[PDB]
Structures are given as structure tokens and as C-alpha cells.
Amino acid sequence: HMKITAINVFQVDLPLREGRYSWSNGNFVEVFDSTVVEIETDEGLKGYAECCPLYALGVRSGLQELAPHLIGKDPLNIGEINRVMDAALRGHPYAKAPIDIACWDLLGKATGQPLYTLLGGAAQDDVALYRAISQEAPEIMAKKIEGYAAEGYTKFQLKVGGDANDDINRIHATRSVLKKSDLLVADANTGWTRHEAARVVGAVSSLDVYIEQPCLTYEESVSIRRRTALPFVLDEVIDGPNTLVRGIAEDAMDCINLKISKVGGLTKAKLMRDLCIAHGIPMTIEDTWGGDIVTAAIAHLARSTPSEFTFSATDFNSYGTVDIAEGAPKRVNGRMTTSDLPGLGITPIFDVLGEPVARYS
Amino acid sequence: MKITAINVFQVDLPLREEVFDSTVVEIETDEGLKGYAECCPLGSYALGVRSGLQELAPHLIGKDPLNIGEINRVMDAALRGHPYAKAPIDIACWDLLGKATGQPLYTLLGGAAQDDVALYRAISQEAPEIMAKKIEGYAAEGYTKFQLKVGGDANDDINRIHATRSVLKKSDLLVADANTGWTRHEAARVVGAVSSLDVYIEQPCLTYEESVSIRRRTALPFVLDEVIDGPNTLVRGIAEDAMDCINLKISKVGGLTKAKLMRDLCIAHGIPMTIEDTWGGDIVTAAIAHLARSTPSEFTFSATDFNSYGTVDIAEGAPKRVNGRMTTSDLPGLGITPIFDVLGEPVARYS
Amino acid sequence: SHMKITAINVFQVDLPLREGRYSWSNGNFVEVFDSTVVEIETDEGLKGYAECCPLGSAYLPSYALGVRSGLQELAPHLIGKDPLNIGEINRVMDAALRGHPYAKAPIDIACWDLLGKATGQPLYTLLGGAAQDDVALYRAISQEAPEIMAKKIEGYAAEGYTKFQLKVGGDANDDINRIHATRSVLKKSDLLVADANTGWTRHEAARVVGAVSSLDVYIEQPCLTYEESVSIRRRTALPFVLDEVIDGPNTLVRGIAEDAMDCINLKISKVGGLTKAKLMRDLCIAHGIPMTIEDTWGGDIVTAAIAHLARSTPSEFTFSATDFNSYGTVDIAEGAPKRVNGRMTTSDLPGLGITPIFDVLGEPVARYS
Amino acid sequence: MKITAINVFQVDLPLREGRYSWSNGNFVEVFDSTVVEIETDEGLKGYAECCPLSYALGVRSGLQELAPHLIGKDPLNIGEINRVMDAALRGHPYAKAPIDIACWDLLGKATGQPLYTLLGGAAQDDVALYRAISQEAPEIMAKKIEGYAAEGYTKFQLKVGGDANDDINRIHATRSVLKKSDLLVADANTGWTRHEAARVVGAVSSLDVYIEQPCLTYEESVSIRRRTALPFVLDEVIDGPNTLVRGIAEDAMDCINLKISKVGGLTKAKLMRDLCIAHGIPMTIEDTWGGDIVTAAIAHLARSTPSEFTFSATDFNSYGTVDIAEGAPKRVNGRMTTSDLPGLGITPIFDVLGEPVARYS
Ligand SMILES: [Cl-]
Ligand SMILES: [Cl-]
Ligand SMILES: [Cl-]
Ligand SMILES: [Mg+2]
Ligand SMILES: [Mg+2]
Ligand SMILES: [Mg+2]
Ligand SMILES: [Mg+2]
Ligand SMILES: [Mg+2]
Ligand SMILES: [Mg+2]
Ligand SMILES: [Mg+2]
Ligand SMILES: [Mg+2]
Ligand SMILES: [Mg+2]
Ligand code: NI
Ligand code: NI
């Protein structure tokens, strides 16, 4: 019955409290380029979503190539929405994800149900958080991590995947300033070749640390997994159910990181999440980056996941200084929760969103 | 919302052509909405459905029926196995979720992918002229997919499969379902002797290991049923290339929550499903049709209209066969309403 | 001369703990177990007995109900059957009911008890012959503060126990402390098994086995599934034990072929009775796999079954057994094994060699005839 | 109860057909069988028989090593009897088997039970029989198989494993004179290399036949298993629980042949049988050869095996002309059964056995 009448695309800068974020391969960003999507219906309801990769041009040009073909369609038939887009455009999961998420928001609004119920039921009241720690000098990384620990975070993900020696130093320096019970993940974001990775995991093999996504490919990464007894996490190479199943059958990892937009939206993320639970694979529920609306999606998928299989999530809104939505999850002593309001539970602040850089109708 | 009572009904389901013991479950909430489901195994086994529900129910009073993930965790913690007792609880909660959200089940299961769905016809082994006349009638009402029961004497089964393949249109599909009835050596002989027929082989043996042994020796399209009992065994089969299709029985796998996950895994790996259950009346058939409607045609080998095969209607708003196919309404939940005159008084109440 | 089953009577009995509470993985705990005793009556006047006691409280509706409802569903199919034809008994049960190994186990064991009585032989002979006069025992150590686990272990080692099963599979960091603390209080020759009872995910298990890699400890059942456990197996050089996932000869065969473990625990009732347990036992011997002979829990009648199976296992392949009856406060049968200096034996009386104490078992909660 | 004496008897078993021939040009006209009798201090006696396909001299000199170690021991403790035998003599299943079997007979006698009850319980009232067909000219094997079919036998093992071309002709000639429902196993008894086996199974691929033990080794035999769609049987390489488990785990066969004496006695055979049942593997329950006493053991093991997993048994006593015991199984219409008498249920005809050829006390 309900039909999509317009898709609007908004652009908003998300600056960083820390001023810069840096990771593997020397990459950095000072101000993130976020895109918010609004889907309007013929019955007054509107759905929202956000995509913010580490790219933003591709999100918006991707949306150009997808949106016109969704006009008139039913936003509540989420399977059919996804079918159209996949038939419309190869790849571009970053353009696809916000359409999918905005449709789930509409589904929640139309049904009067918060997303965690619609994603399978509330499995936990609130959710464990990690803080990502930008790639810098070892002693600076150590200092920032003490700060965040003092705010109540108990899980941390270092951005290594730089020079191998540098990273050995970074992992040592940060592990040394944490308390025993705090959890430290070294996330290379693909920045090592296997001989580099071998040297890093060799030199930290007695540290209480997790090794995450050492190399670019699945095969290179498994080569590392087979040489360490340290608990091991795959992230970028797990982009859908097929690669996930393969990694499960082949014992390629102990945990995965699930980036909602990278895998193409909530529909896909949910499938992977249900698969993992079935095989005892805990997940970090996150995304590439974002603000209030990205954080809301994260928190709803996470709350619908048992604590047992939530390794961690993160709260991207607190990393930035610009608020783009009201009713977003907030962090209290290192943990996040949501309200029980319908859909994502959020209300965009149109004054900061400004004018839509694109309309489709 | 809170579950305030679980009531258990018994109903005899006679066949048109001997009587099955079906169980219907009603869940009542402190808000007036009620959820329904049905479970009917082949039979004995109905006792276990009702004893399982007896063991489950007390743990569910007070719970939020809409938190379907929590309902399932609670059931799995209280009781091991018994998928036939867990399944109607799960489905009745899905029906409540539809009711509370005013959405048909196919939408809540991921969205309508098919306006209506294919069915299949089991072909009784009779004199070749009686078969051929029935086939003409089946073909006239839209049927193009057919099944025969095998899994008995190997040489007899070889004959039956040849006989039945002969009387069908070349474009018709034929599935030989051994229903686990063969040992490895029997199965090898049968699939060996029909290697040049356009036939599917379904569930030759009792276990996964035995079935895989047969799989590795035949090029014929290969279907597993009984041994694919959950997402875990499914992923095993997927990774080991143990089968081209499956038969998905909603109750045997423990409900829609589990069937849905299995359904999505199959889609992702190009594995079509026969979507049915062990048996049932109107309310089992509704669950089947909603799940089949949320599956694309490409991955629906067929569904089944069990209610066509009985003589007692137990719910209104049920799916109905028209011209070899079945659909659902868009009413909330399963879209059915039970006919309580037929169901009788509860055989059990929990509160 | 063809003996037939005339009735099945089912008794319920509470079994409290000397220690007051027993705690294991996932924050599970019990203070009073809910045990079931089965009595198989025959037209000759001979009776067979068995006990089954899964991990659960008499004070909540738990797994013991499923033992008793499973017996309810089996019983009608057993009336008139020949209980000495144990193969047929098991075939009749499997046809009647899927799963419910805890319901089927005591019927099988009670039929063995009847075979022993009909033949005048003790179970250990019918199960293959006495290979040991008495059997080494381990003590299960409840999951608590490391200091309390360490202190209880010292007490039990002083009573003569030389082997121990820690109940870990809680929080990983706690479990690391528990394993160090308890290993430290035991002489080198005492054996220490860290039994997770499926209580860890693989990343948790990886951290724990990495942190105890240099201790003389065994790691048992780290994770829920076979696949998750084998992933831990491949990353540790420590001796490795499987338990819950070895539910029968088929998974046992799989684990042997794939080098998934160095030892197993054999829980008689969980595998579905002495007939299944014996097959698995003999297969273990042929492949050089030591076994812990045990059960989920129980009192004197469980303990008798354990003792007979253990006695019929060569010492070389008996990693241990346990005497569940000395963990509790309530005696339910005469003629049961009694630990002496960390070991138990049996009498040569026919069958299990036990006679229940009906003052304690009370009135049957069900009779089927 | 304890063993007070062990007597060893020798008896010639001639063939009704005058000769039996099998792979590699082998043949025998008169079998040299050994019967063991174990005396106890209570006056009960246990009996067994072993008759391998010289081998007999091996059985008897093996017993010469074993028996003295058993005087004084408890024969109802079958496990301890076996352990004493294994610590005395490495290998020699044919020498150990009749001891193990004779103790099972004693256990039956001491308990008042027939062996089929002590081996696990009656599973069939009577059992299907096959006739072994001697390796001769095709038309001779064909004429003999017809006569045996006329007597009621519905199953047959050809003794092939000779020249490949001859074997192809044998298998064609015999298949063609049988009713459709009769089963035909082509048993090469290891007599082919794999190029020979490949030609044979290629040439008979459209016949309704089973292929048994084509080659000497497990590895060579599996190579044939993977090439053919025909049902496949292993025999000689399945010599114990360990090779059986390897075969099961590797999907090396659809059925097995279980030779009681070759695997070391009823104890090991029961173990193997019970494992075969668990994994859905039907068995041919047999032995190398023998008279009435070997037959009684076969029949008791067959009777405690469900019909579904009894591919067949054979009644060796009907192949020969010398009766050595009363109470033995007698084939009636291609089936045999046992009485319910205790133990093996037989009593040796001492008249036929003659004076013991060895005595131990
Ligand atoms: Cl049908
Ligand atoms: Cl008695
Ligand atoms: Cl010739
Ligand atoms: Mg690099
Ligand atoms: Mg990452
Ligand atoms: Mg018609
Ligand atoms: Mg069959
Ligand atoms: Mg089927
Ligand atoms: Mg845990
Ligand atoms: Mg254990
Ligand atoms: Mg040759
Ligand atoms: Mg042979
Ligand atoms: Ni593009
Ligand atoms: Ni039950």
C-alpha cells in the first residue's frame, strides 16, 4: 500500500574531537564526509539512514544510479527493494546500505516497533563499547588510551597496519598502560603483507592481544591465523554470507567485525549476524564511520544480539563534535543503550543537514 | 506485552483418500491478541509434541511473545531437542508479531517475493492406465512437478521410477524420494540403474555420511531432507557440496525463525527448497505459504497445500489451491482464525 | 523360560550435596539434584534397577521431567518385551522415540541388571570381564573463587583422591586464576583437568589455553560444538579431552579419524546406556584413547554402573572414574561402591549388585503395566 | 571357575565338490581343521573350531604357545583370557580365536544362555545364506550356481581374481542364469592389480553385481572403489576395528565381510559388527572355512545381527562330508538358524575328532 515518493540526499561534515584520524597505509582524515538519506512516502512517514565511508563521492554517484529506480516502490517490502538495487548496480554497497536502512526505519515507524525487536528481539539492555585509537606515535597512542579508559571504555582497537616495527612499539606501549582486564585489539586494516604480519604477531605473542585483519586477502590472512595462537578477527575480507560461510567451514577466524554499510545494509548484516550466532562467532558490530544516525543502526543491531556474541560495538557519535539527530544512543560507563521508540528511534536535525544536494522523485 | 496463557488443542485430521493427530497451540496475551500455530507429525509422535509443550509452557508465562529471539533462547534452555514442540510456540509468536504490527507474515519474513507459489503432486504406484489418467488430470490443473515414494526393495524401486518417468511429459519434473529407506549398497544400485533418467534423488539414506556417499557417485540432481535439520547441518552440506536442493520442513527444524535463516542461506548458495512440513491442516498450510511467498521463485522448488488432502477445515482465511498453485491473503500474521467448534476444548491449559 | 517385562515403576528422589551447592559453566548451579530411579519388573519376579540424574534442581521444573516424561512415552512399548534381549529393547526404544538418551539409558542399564540377575553374573563380567580390582577416582571441583577451589582440592587430595576435574568455563580471566591456583596446591603426580563444559567461545578458549600452556593440565570440552573445539585443539600442544560432543559411536569415530582428542569422557546416561557406552569403550581401547568413566550426576545406583564399566576397562585406558555417591548426603541403595583411599571397587553380586532403599525412594511417581 | 585342561583335536574336512579353487591358482581338496576344547574344574566344557584357508600347523603351534598360560585362569573373564594371550604371543589371530570362542561357549554354559543372547540379543529368527562358487570354467560355475539356486540359495559369491578375461566371462555366465532377485558378488580375493580390476569392473558395469576385494592392499582397492558405480565390498583388508574405522571414515566400502577367526574371535568380531551396525554397513558374516562348529559360531553372530545389516552368512557344514558335532545349524531352503541351547549349542562327536593331537594341563 505504502509507496516511496521521494529520495533526498544530504551532505554533512563530521569533524573530529581529536582533529585527525589515521590508519593503515598512511591514510588520514580530518573531517569526515557523511551522507544522510531521507526516504519520503505517500503516507507521511519518512525513513532515515546515514553512510560515511573512510568514497563519499561514490556513495552519492551510486545513489544517483539507484534512487530513481526505487520511486513508486514499496519501502516495506525490503527484499524487493534490495532486489531492485542489486539488479541496478554492481557493487556500491555504500550506496545501497542507506536505502536498506531507511526502509527498516520506515518499517519500524509503520509498525510502531523499535528496530531491535524487528531485527529479532532485544537480547541485551545495553552494549559493550570499544574505542578506536588513531595511528600515531606509540607514546601518544598510550596517552589517549589512558584518557578513554578513564571515561569508562574497557575495549580498544588500535589502528596499526603501518610499519611493522612501529606497530610492535605501538602494541607494546598501549598494552602496558591498560589494566589486565581491559581488552586490546590490534587492527591492521589490511596494512601488512604476510612477512610483515608474521614479524608483528611474532613479537607480540606473549601479550594479551587480539590480531585483526592483518592482510588484504582472505588467503593471506589465513596464513597469519595459522601461525599464531592469539585470538584472531576478520573484518574487510568478510563482506557477505558466502565469504562468511567459507571462513566458518575453514576455521579462518575466532570473531568477525561486521560493518553494517560495508556489507550493504541491515538486511545483509542481520543475515551474517544470525549465521555467526549459530556458529558461536562473536562479532564487533560497527560501521565504517558516522554520526548519530550511523550509531543508532549499530546500537539496534547490537541490542538484538546476545551479549555472548557481542564482542563489542562503538559509538561514533561521541568521536565527533557535530550532532545530526536527536534521540540517538549515548554512552554511559563504556556501554551504549537505546530507547524503545519506533525504527531507529531518531529525528534528524535539518538545520545542520542543510539543503539536499540531490533530490529524486 | 506478556504471555498470560498457553492452551493446547487436539484435532483429528482425516484424509480424503488414515487419520492424523494434529495439535493446535493458542497463546494469549494481557492485551487480548492471541497467536496460533499447528504441528502434526507423521503418525505416537503427537504425544511428544504435547509432552514437549507441557515441559516448555511454564517457562513462557510472563515472557514477551514479540521478542522472538528471547522466546527461543528460553525454550532451548528449558528443553533439549523436541523441534516439533518448539516450532508451534515460535510460529504462534510470529503470528502475534503480525497481529501487533498489522503486517502479514510474508512481510515480516523479509517481504513478498512471489504472488503465488508452485505445488507438487505425489504419484501413487498403480496400474499404468490408472496412473496415466490421473496424470492427465494433474496436468490439466496446473501441476508440472511430481514425486514418487521409493526406498523399498531396490529392484522394485528401479522399476517404479522407470514406469513413472515414462508416463510423464518430457518437461515435467520427477523426484524419487527414498525417505531414508536405502542402505549404501541398495542406493548405489538404484541411482546406478536410473543414471540416464531425468530424475531427482531425494534422501536415499538415514544419515548425512551415508547420503554423501551416494552423492559422490551420482551426477543426478540430489536433494536432502531429513538430515538437514538446522542451520548448522545445512552449512556443513553447503560447504561440502552434499546436495543441489533441500526439503525444508518448518516443524522439523523448530519453527519459522530457524526456517527463515535456513531459507536465506539456501538462497545465497543457489539451493532451491521444497517448503513444507511433515503434515498438517489449515494452520500448517498458512505457515508454509507465508514462508514460500517470502522466497523467490528461483529458490522455491515447490510448497505444499496439506489442507487440500484433508476433509476437516480448522481455520478460516487459510491458503487454498487454485490451478496447481497456492497463495495467502495480506491479513495480519498468519491471516487465519481458528474454528473453535472443530478444535474442541483444550486438552491442556498453562497459565 | 522366556522372561517378559510386566511393569515399569519410576521413582523420584532428591539428592542434596555435602558441599551445599555445585556450580559449573554459564553460571549454572544446583543445590539439590532431582534423581530418577527405574525399576523394571518381570513375570519371574526378578527386577532390574537403574538411576538417571541429569544436571538440574529438584526445586525447579528441569531436565529430570524429560527423563520421566520420556519413560512415560517408552514404557508402553516395553511391556511384554524380553528384557534379556537387550539389542531388541534398544531397537524398540529407538523406534518409539527420537532422542531422549537420558530416558533410554536407565531402561538399558536396568535390562543389563536383569541379565546379570538371570545369569548369576556381575555386570563387569557381562561387559567384558574384570580388568581391575579397583579403579582410580577423580573429584569434581565446583566453580568458585580460586582460593576456595584450591582449599577444597587440598582437602580431597588429603582424603586420597589423586585426580581432579575443575569446573571452569566461566569468565576467562577467573578461569586462568582458578587453574593456576589449583595446579599449585597439587603434587606433580596428581592429574588436573580443566573442564570448561562447553563454557567458552573460541576466542575465550584461545586466551585461556595460551595462558596455561606451560602448566601440566588437561583441557576438556572448551566449546559447545565439535568444530569449535577442534579449533582449540589445533592451537594447543596440551593434552586435550572431549566429552559432551562425543555423544555416540559415530561422533567418536569422527573424532578418532580426525585426531580431535587424546582422551574422552564417557557419560553412561548421556550416550544412552551401557550398551552404547560399552561399544564406545571398546573402540577407545582399540585406538589407544583413555577414558574417564562417569555420568552427568547421581547417587549410589549411578555409582554402581560406573564402577562396573570402569572395572571392565584396563587400567591403562581408564584415565579415571568418579564416585558420585560420596558427593551427596542421601543413601539410596545397599551394596553400592564406596570409595576407600581414592579408589572404588564392586562386589561380585549379580548385575549391578545393588538393592534400593525404598524407605528413601518412597512411593513410585509412576507405574506402567 | 577355572581352566583345568585344554585339548586340541585335528580333523580332515573333505569337500562335496572334491575341490575348491580361488584367486592366484589356489585350490584345496581336503581342509585341515582344528577343534579346541577347554575343560574347567566344574566339569563344563567350551568348544571352538578354526580352519583357515600349514595355516593349520600355524594354528596348532600357536596354541602350543598360548595354552599353558591359560591353565588356572578364569575362562568367564573373556577380557583377561585375551590379555593373557596377547602378552604371550604377538598377532596370530587364528591361534587366539578358538580360545576366545571356546570361552564364549563356556560363558553361555555357565549362564544358561545361547550365544546370540550374550552377543547382543536375537535380532533374526533365521538367516540368509550365500553359496561360494569355486573358480572354474564359466559354464561350469554357471551350471553349479543353477543347482545351488534350485536348492534355495538366493545369494552367491563367485571366486574370481584369476585372469581378467576369464573373470569377465565367469561373471557374465553366472549372472545370466540367475533370477533377477538373486544377488551375485564377484569376489576377487585380492587377485587383481588395479589395471586388471579396472578392465573387469568396466566390462561388467551394466550387470547387477557387487565387487569384492579386488586387490591386495586397501589403497589399491579404494582406487577401484572410486572408479565404479557398482556396490563395493571389502574383506581381507578389514582385519580389525582399526582398519574398519579407517574404511568407514574414508568411505572405502558399502559392505564388509567379517571372518570370525581371521579377526581374532567372537569378541573382536562382535565389536566390529556393532560398529558396522552404528554406521549402516551391512556385513557378510562368515569365516575362512570350517565344519559344524565354525557354522554354529557364524549362526549365533548372524542371529544377533538385524536382517538389515546381514548381507548374508554361509553354512560351511553343507560344503563338506564329515559331521563333527551334534546340535549344529542345518540349512533349510537357503536359510539357517540355531537352537536356544546354551553357548554354541553343539556337542562334539569325539568319535570323529579322534584322540587329541595335543593336550595342556
Ligand atoms: Cl502430498
Ligand atoms: Cl531381583
Ligand atoms: Cl577356465
Ligand atoms: Mg602496508
Ligand atoms: Mg577493523
Ligand atoms: Mg482433476
Ligand atoms: Mg530399507
Ligand atoms: Mg522428502
Ligand atoms: Mg561462557
Ligand atoms: Mg566433562
Ligand atoms: Mg592376479
Ligand atoms: Mg571374500
Ligand atoms: Ni560508481
Ligand atoms: Ni520429551
Swiss-Prot record, chain A:
Active site location: K159, K259
UniProt-listed Enzyme Commission number(s): 4.2.1.171
Gene Ontology molecular function terms on file: amino acid binding; hydro-lyase activity; isomerase activity; magnesium ion binding
Effect seen on changing K259A: Loss of enzymatic activity
Induction annotation: Is up-regulated when the bacterium is grown on c3LHyp or t3LHyp as sole carbon source.
Catalytic activity of the protein: cis-3-hydroxy-L-proline = 1-pyrroline-2-carboxylate + H2O
Binding site for Mg(2+): D187, E212, D235
Required cofactor(s): Mg(2+)
Pfam families: MR_MLE_C, MR_MLE_N
GO biological process terms on file: alpha-amino acid metabolic process; cellular response to amino acid stimulus
Cofactor binding note: Binds 1 Mg(2+) ion per subunit.
Keyword field: Isomerase, Lyase, Magnesium, Metal-binding
Organism domain of life: Bacteria
Function, as annotated: Catalyzes the dehydration of cis-3-hydroxy-L-proline (c3LHyp) to Delta(1)-pyrroline-2-carboxylate (Pyr2C). Is likely involved in a degradation pathway that converts c3LHyp to L-proline, which allows L.aggregata to grow on c3LHyp as a sole carbon source. Also catalyzes the epimerization of c3LHyp to trans-3-hydroxy-D-proline (t3DHyp), a competing reaction occurring from the same enolate anion intermediate. L-proline, t3LHyp, t4LHyp, c4DHyp and their methylated derivatives are not substrates.
UniProt record similarity statement: Belongs to the mandelate racemase/muconate lactonizing enzyme family.
Name of the protein this chain belongs to: Cis-3-hydroxy-L-proline dehydratase
